[PDB]
Structures are given as C-alpha cells and as structure tokens.
Design a protein around this ligand. Sequence first.
Ligand SMILES: CC(=O)N[C@H]1[C@H](Oc2ccc([N+](=O)[O-])cc2)O[C@H](CO)[C@@H](O)[C@@H]1O[C@@H]1O[C@H](CO)[C@H](O)[C@H](O)[C@H]1O[C@@H]1O[C@@H](C)[C@@H](O)[C@@H](O)[C@@H]1O
Ligand SMILES: CC(=O)N[C@H]1[C@H](Oc2ccc([N+](=O)[O-])cc2)O[C@H](CO)[C@@H](O)[C@@H]1O[C@@H]1O[C@H](CO)[C@H](O)[C@H](O)[C@H]1O[C@@H]1O[C@@H](C)[C@@H](O)[C@@H](O)[C@@H]1O
Ligand code: NA
Ligand code: NA
Lengths: 302, 311
Amino acid sequence: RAFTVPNIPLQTLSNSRFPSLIQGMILSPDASQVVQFQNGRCLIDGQLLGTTPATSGQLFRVRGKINQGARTLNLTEVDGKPFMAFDSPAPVGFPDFGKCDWHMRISKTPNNTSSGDPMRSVSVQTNVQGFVPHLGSIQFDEVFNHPTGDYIGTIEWISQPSTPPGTDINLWEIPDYGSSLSQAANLAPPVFPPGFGEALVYFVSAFPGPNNRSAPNDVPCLLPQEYITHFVSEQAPTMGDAALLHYVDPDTNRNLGEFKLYPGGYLTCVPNGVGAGPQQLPLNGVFLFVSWVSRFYQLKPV
Amino acid sequence: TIEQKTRAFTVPNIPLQTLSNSRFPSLIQGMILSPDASQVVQFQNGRCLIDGQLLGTTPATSGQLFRVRGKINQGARTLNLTEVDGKPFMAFDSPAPVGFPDFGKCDWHMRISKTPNNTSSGDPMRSVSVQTNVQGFVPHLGSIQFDEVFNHPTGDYIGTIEWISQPSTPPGTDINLWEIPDYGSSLSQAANLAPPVFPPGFGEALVYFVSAFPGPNNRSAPNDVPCLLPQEYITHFVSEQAPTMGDAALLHYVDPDTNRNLGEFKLYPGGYLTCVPNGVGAGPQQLPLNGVFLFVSWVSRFYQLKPVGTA
Ligand SMILES: CC(=O)N[C@H]1[C@H](Oc2ccc([N+](=O)[O-])cc2)O[C@H](CO)[C@@H](O)[C@@H]1O[C@@H]1O[C@H](CO)[C@H](O)[C@H](O)[C@H]1O[C@@H]1O[C@@H](C)[C@@H](O)[C@@H](O)[C@@H]1O
Ligand SMILES: CC(=O)N[C@H]1[C@H](Oc2ccc([N+](=O)[O-])cc2)O[C@H](CO)[C@@H](O)[C@@H]1O[C@@H]1O[C@H](CO)[C@H](O)[C@H](O)[C@H]1O[C@@H]1O[C@@H](C)[C@@H](O)[C@@H](O)[C@@H]1O
Ligand code: NA
Ligand code: NA
C-alpha cells in the first residue's frame, strides 16, 4: 500500500495528547529540548507506542475502581477491560501531562439512578509516591467519600505542581509512571533534536488552568491524532529514511514549505535562520506526501 | 484529476470497539436498532454523505465536536454563540455553530471556563444549566439561555455538556436522545438542518452506534446516545472524497480472529447503515464489538441482505 497522509487542513486536525483542535505549529523554545510523550506516538507504518490510542475516543481518559473511603483508583482500560500491570506505563489513552496537578472530573458508570449529579471532583499529584500507574493505581489528594464503583472521567483543568513549591507547569515533560522499586516498562522512547539544521515540529493546543506566567497552558504533541488513526488503518510500509511532505495552501495549491516525516512518527523542518520556522505559516494548509527520501536529502529552509 | 475521479471507495480498517461516537467524543459501546421500528431520526451531528459532504452541524473531526463557545456579560443569562475557534457564527446559514450539541429532550449541565487563561491561580470552571425547550434556546438565532444569572466576569467562554438529566418541563417526562432540540423559534425555524433519516422498510432497519453519556433518567439506565456513523468514517470520507459509484456500499462485519462474516450491512450514500434483523429480538446488538466493517462491493438499493443475528 502506498503511503499517504490525511487530506485535511491542519487547523481542523486534533492534538494527540488531548482531544482538541490544533491551534499552532511550533519549534521547541529550547533548541535542545528532548521529548518523551507517551501519547501521540505512532510509527508511520501504524505501530502505536507508549500509551497511544488508535483514535480520539480512548484518548485522555481515566477509568478504574475505587472504594468508598479510599484514596486509590485502581486502573482499568477505558473500556473496562483489566489493565495488565508491569507491561505498559499506563492504560491506553491515560494522560501524559507531566509537571502539573490534575483536577479531574469522574462519575460512576453505568448510570443506575433516576436523579442526581453524578460528577465528582478529585485531584491528582503526579510526582508523589502514590502516583504509580505502571503498577495499576493512582492516588487522589483526598479520601474519596462517595459510593464504591467503576469510575470514568478525565482531567478538566491543570495547575502548578504542589511540590516542589513555586515550580511552574511544564507540559514538555511526562509524569513519573514508575514506582519506588520499579521503573515503568515499555515507555515510548525519547525523541532527540535532529541537528544538521533540522528541528522538530510540535502541534500545540491550549488546555484550561492557571500557571506562573498567567498565560495559556500550551500542550505540544508530535502528530495530529488523525494521522495516527490513518496510519493504523493504512499500515503502509516505510520505504525511505523519511517521507518528504509539502505543506500546501489548498486555496492556491502553493507549496508553503518542505517537511520530513520520519519513520519514528515525528516531523522536522529546516528553519531559515532565527525568527523563521513553521510558526510563521498559516494553519489552513494541508500536508501532502511527495516522495520517500534518503538520509542524504537536505530540506529547503522554511 | 483522473485519480480523484477514479478514487476507490474505502472505510477505515479499525475494529468497531476502537471507533468513536459522532454525537459526542467517546468510544462506541454497542450497535442497536431503534426500539420503535418506525423511528425517524434527524441528528445534526454525525451526518456526512459517503463522498465526504458534511451535513447539519457535523465537524470533519472530533476536535470540534460537542463544544460550545460564546460571549456572556456578567449578570446576564444569554450566551452569544461563536464557532469553536472563536470566529463569528453566521446565523441563518446553519442550525448552530459547527459541533454544537444536538441532544434533544434533556436538560444540559455544562462546564465552561473563560478563555484564554490570564491567571496564576484559581479554579476557572463554571457550572451552568441549559433547558432546550424554552423560549431562550435559539442557537439558530445565535444564542442560548442559562437557567440562572451568570455572576462571573464578562468574557469569552468555552466548554461542553458534562452530564444530562430529564427535561425540567413537562415535569416527569424522560430523556429522549432519539430527538434533537428545536434550534430556531416560532418566528424563525432553523435553516439548513440535516434532513431526516427514515426507516428503509422491506426488511431493512437502521443501525445505530451507541455510547453512554453521564446522568440519570427515569429508567435508571445508561443514557445511550445513538449516532449514524463512527466519527472516523466521517473524517475518512472528508479526506478521501471517493466518488459514490452505486446505490449502496455492501459491508461485511468481519471477525478479525476467524475472517468469517458476522453480518451483512448496506451503507447508503446519505451516510447511514442498514441491516436485516433475523426475526423479532434479533439484530446487530448480538454481534461482538471487535469486528471490522469491510467494503465488499457497490450494490443496487434492491440488493437483499442476509439476515443478521438470532431470534
Ligand atoms: C489548597 C488551595 O486551595 N491552595 C491555593 C491557595 O489557597 C489559599 C491560600 C491561603 C489561604 N488563606 O490564607 O486563608 C486560603 C486559601 O491559594 C493559592 C493562591 O491563590 C493557590 O495557588 C493554591 O492553589 C494550589 O496551588 C498549588 C501550587 O502551589 C497547586 O497548583 C494546587 O493544585 C492548587 O490548588 C488548586 O487550586 C485552588 C485554587 C483550589 O481550587 C484547589 O482546590 C485546587 O486543588
Ligand atoms: C432544582 C433541583 O435541584 N431539582 C432536583 C430536586 O432538588 C431538590 C428537591 C427538594 C428540595 N427541597 O426539599 O428543598 C430541594 C432541591 O431533587 C430531585 C430528586 O429528589 C431531582 O430530580 C431534581 O433534579 C432536577 O430534575 C429535573 C427533572 O424533574 C431536571 O432533570 C433538572 O435538570 C434536575 O436538576 C439537576 O439535578 C439536580 C440533582 C441538581 O444537580 C441541579 O443543579 C441540576 O440542575
Ligand atoms: Na510514580
Ligand atoms: Na428553540
């Protein structure tokens, strides 16, 4: 099967770390930034990595059992199937927002009642001893004095981590999935800056909550979720060092810039000096697969 | 181009249990027939022709789906709607902004926040409620009305429905997610509503994909939200724009373990699926959820399907 990417404008595509439209395309503020996101990780032949779901339905949800009077949510997969501990960093689609406090909204499922607000607020710190999703559990800040059951929900807003005091949100990082006696197994590996004039491209969407900068919380990811779904369905074999893409204005068919899509599931470009980069481009463009290229192909600066 | 006008029709090669509802973002949890065999539906989301033409308020992707955005003044009850990206909603052009919820016959309990963040601390989340059968529910006219005065700063608010409950009026009536709200008013009805979808008859019945949405109802049961197409199908069709080459696309719902056909379905160009239930009580609800719909052939609308399920 021949390789393709979805024929949909970037601004209509979705973040792969949480369900939301993509609102920007950027380089990392630190040129040396290494990332290790667990969601939005997919080899371009359709192999999912880390905790990455095939589709948005599973993305950025948390599900588990909790007993009345406990602080611990014992995780399952989003569809209620058992989570196999020690195997993966966390259930598929589990949030990968590091360096922040999570303020979640959850509810008991299925409904078995004729009245009542089912929504419960809980908070999760990700750098504490009780945050051990790789062992199958996370700990809420407070005792959960609500009925025992199967709860499902998501993070509604984030704030600065409670500890160390004063530290800011840093969404370039992932939480500590592991425990005191065990590192998390099968983490999607780190992605390093490519060098040779190339730079990683990140797709960003704003997420609710405060921070020390009194500005939006911007969530960077490596691939639009629709690209992931496409690759999972298509399973097109990787036949070059990189897939050369053109970012095309669909109104005019003008090529706005060359990008490389690497087998590992990330995009690069060559910024044309400081100030230049993909953030200068309109967001109504569509990426188009042009050709497989070798390791010796040099991108035209953007 | 020649390639574009000859592009072969395809559907996403992903098991149903991994696909998403197109009326709100969630995994599909089942397939059902409508309890009433005469049920006509007119959902505004999850509506797409199989050549990629979006209908109603249907977004191309899940990013825009089931969101509400607008401006509200402190001390007011009126949310003046915009598109999800903050751009103006061109009223009269559509029933509502793209992705606007189409949950009829229920009270909406929403969570919204002021955007963008300009704070260094504080919970930004606000609870508001919306009734859909009241005078103030006029999304087609560009606004909806909250139950209570909004005593929070004037600004641009974004959010969604978090949970639903029975309509407040008429008192005692139940949630009915088969219905859409009245988008317009008595003086102005909603323009460019996606058209109704009617039972095909002659042995065929419409297939609905369901996902549970939080909240109570009179039956103490999950609020199962039915939709006509998985969202991934819609995104696929928008991207592919494959020409429709026949009356209907014959699909086989195939078991990935055995490669056996578990059921025959027809996908009609209007963007909905039918099957033939194998007697009373039989239907697609009896099939496992790990099957994959595979495109077999273009067929005539008169093509007869092998009955599905067991009586
Ligand atoms: C627990 C809490 O609400 N902490 C607030 C802190 O609140 C108060 C400070 C002092 C008094 N007092 O002297 O009487 C009373 C309340 O206020 C500061 C400044 O507004 C907040 O930053 C702080 O919020 C917490 O901050 C830490 C990081 O230091 C972390 O981000 C927590 O998640 C965050 O708590 C969350 O937000 C607050 C506003 C509240 O909604 C909590 O329920 C949330 O967990
Ligand atoms: C307004 C309200 O909360 N209505 C509740 C009702 O609440 C009360 C009952 C009695 C007293 N009192 O004696 O003083 C005070 C409040 O409680 C019944 C259950 O006994 C709920 O069914 C009712 O909830 C409302 O029900 C109507 C349909 O009849 C409709 O679904 C409303 O949306 C729903 O209100 C919502 O749920 C309640 C629980 C609450 O969360 C509200 O804020 C929601 O809007
Ligand atoms: Na940990
Ligand atoms: Na109305």
